[PDB]
Amino acid sequence: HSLRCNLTIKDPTPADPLWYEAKCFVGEILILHLSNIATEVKKCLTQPLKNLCQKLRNKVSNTKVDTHYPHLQVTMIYPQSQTPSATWEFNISDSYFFTFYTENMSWRSANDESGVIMNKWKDDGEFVKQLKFLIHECSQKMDEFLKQSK
């Protein structure tokens, strides 16, 4: 399989003060688990993912929603390079869906309402750079690790 990181951004509550969680898998094996509450790849990914979760929180704070438990889920999918590329899938509250492909810096929305939010988000040059840059920064170590799994 690929290396997959599932990020969740949500509102903390007295019952659960978690506002972000990150779980990176290779197949069934959990390889990294982060929250506000494999060594070399864990090391490479940790701060960039934490930094990205902070940025995503800010993006969520500025997004106009309309649904009848707000939450952002982001899935990063990195295949073994064998030029390194990834897919970033965004799901805002099970309502808006769009995808960024780092390979050609291209985007796809599920519908026009998702496209409006997507277009606002991708206007943020820093945000888009973080998505592309994380891949280049950790590509080699991700490849190396995926080699171990074989």
């Binding site: 060594t39 070399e40 080699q140 190396e144 080699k147 171990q148």
Partner: protein, 125 residues
């Protein structure tokens, strides 16, 4: 179950069709590499702790095929593949762009001009 290990040069140690030889002459890293090359091999590479388990027992220090690129501080094998922390633990000493194998899947950085014994390896094909 019982099969054959090779092909290897005469008198070399064979395991999983990988061929090893332990050379007791003291040479610089460069001279050690040239010696291995002249025998159709390269210096020792650790590709798998599991598959090369017995090498944990090799005492003393020996030149192996691990080299630094000082520009970015990265380490690679002669063949261009990257050093993996799952292969080997590298103990970095501020000055030195070569490394000796030092048992137990540990390596120590050393000045490439130092004289050491060395280990050649031909990887199974």
């Amino acid at each position: 179950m019982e099969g054959y290990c090779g092909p290897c040069p005469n008198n070399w140690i064979c395991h999983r069709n990988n061929c090893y030889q332990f050379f007791n002459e003291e040479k610089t890293w460069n001279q050690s590499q040239a010696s291995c090359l002249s025998q159709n091999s390269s210096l020792l590479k650790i590709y798998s702790k599991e598959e090369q388990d017995f090498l944990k027992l090799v005492k003393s220090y020996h030149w192996m095929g691990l080299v630094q690129i000082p520009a970015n501080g990265s380490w690679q094998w002669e063949d261009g593949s990257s050093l993996s922390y799952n292969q080997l633990t590298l103990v970095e000493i501020p000055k030195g762009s070569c490394a000796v194998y030092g048992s137990s899947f540990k390596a120590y950085t050393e000045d490439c001009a130092n004289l050491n014994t060395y280990i050649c390896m031909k990887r199974a094909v």
